[PDB]
């Protein structure tokens, strides 16, 4: 199931769109795979890099469970 480029902006930073990123997120340091949200390569890049970036800036649990 494609998620980005339909609810996203094709330009994903942390601010202004963090909720679409957190939709593949939990306070548990995990990202929903393609089996639940089958987003394409660029959308997977978006969610991966941006979510681990929010983890990197101390916005959401980096590894914390």
């Amino acid at each position: 199931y494609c998620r980005f480029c339909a609810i996203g902006q094709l330009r994903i930073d942390l601010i202004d769109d963090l909720e679409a990123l957190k939709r593949f997120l939990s306070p548990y340091a995990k990202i929903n795979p393609r089996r639940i949200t089958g987003n394409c390569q660029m959308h997977q890049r978006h969610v991966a890099k941006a979510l681990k970036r929010a983890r990197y800036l101390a916005l959401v649990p980096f590894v914390k469970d």
């Binding site: 494609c2 094709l10 330009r11 660029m42 101390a58």
Partner: protein, 167 residues
């Protein structure tokens, strides 16, 4: 070529001293000027970056330079008055085009159709209404200009035929 620069500065510093820290950060910033101290609020960090549970968030929006942000990034890192020094460039993946960026208006239409404000249904992204058969549809085939047609007859329609008379 634009820099969205996000600075998370120390703990729960008061707004005035946080702004002064930010001003020092431009003073050690060699990128393009025009950036103004925009307070994004005091946001709770997911973890203490060094010891600060919550940090003051700030954003700066302006252009970007090539060999002028590495030094700013590492100086802002070393400058302990600011904890976190994220950069964003103009190019992440999106379009620089007048026929793929204005397709974000179709994305706004998608936002409108995301919630069924009426009894009728136009929800469920990736629901084929099939409104488009046009587009390019062009591999640019080579146009043929006749030079010589050596016996223009060509055989065609080879039916399955054998031993037509068996009676």
């Amino acid at each position: 070529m634009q820099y969205n620069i996000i600075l998370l500065v120390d703990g729960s510093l008061s707004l005035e001293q946080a702004n002064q820290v930010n001003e020092k950060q431009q003073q050690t910033l060699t990128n393009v000027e025009g950036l103004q101290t925009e307070y994004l609020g005091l946001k709770e960090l997911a973890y203490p970056i060094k010891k600060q549970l919550s940090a003051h968030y700030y954003r700066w929006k302006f252009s970007g330079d090539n060999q002028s942000t590495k030094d700013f990034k590492r100086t802002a890192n070393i400058n302990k008055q600011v904890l976190r020094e994220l950069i964003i460039n103009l190019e992440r993946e999106y379009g620089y085009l007048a026929s793929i960026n204005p397709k974000k208006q179709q994305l706004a239409l998608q936002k409108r159709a995301k919630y069924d404000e009426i009894i009728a249904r136009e929800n469920n992204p990736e629901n084929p209404d099939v409104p488009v058969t046009s587009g390019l549809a062009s591999t640019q085939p080579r146009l043929s200009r006749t030079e010589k047609a050596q016996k223009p007859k060509e055989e065609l329609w080879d039916v399955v035929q054998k031993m037509g008379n068996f009676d």
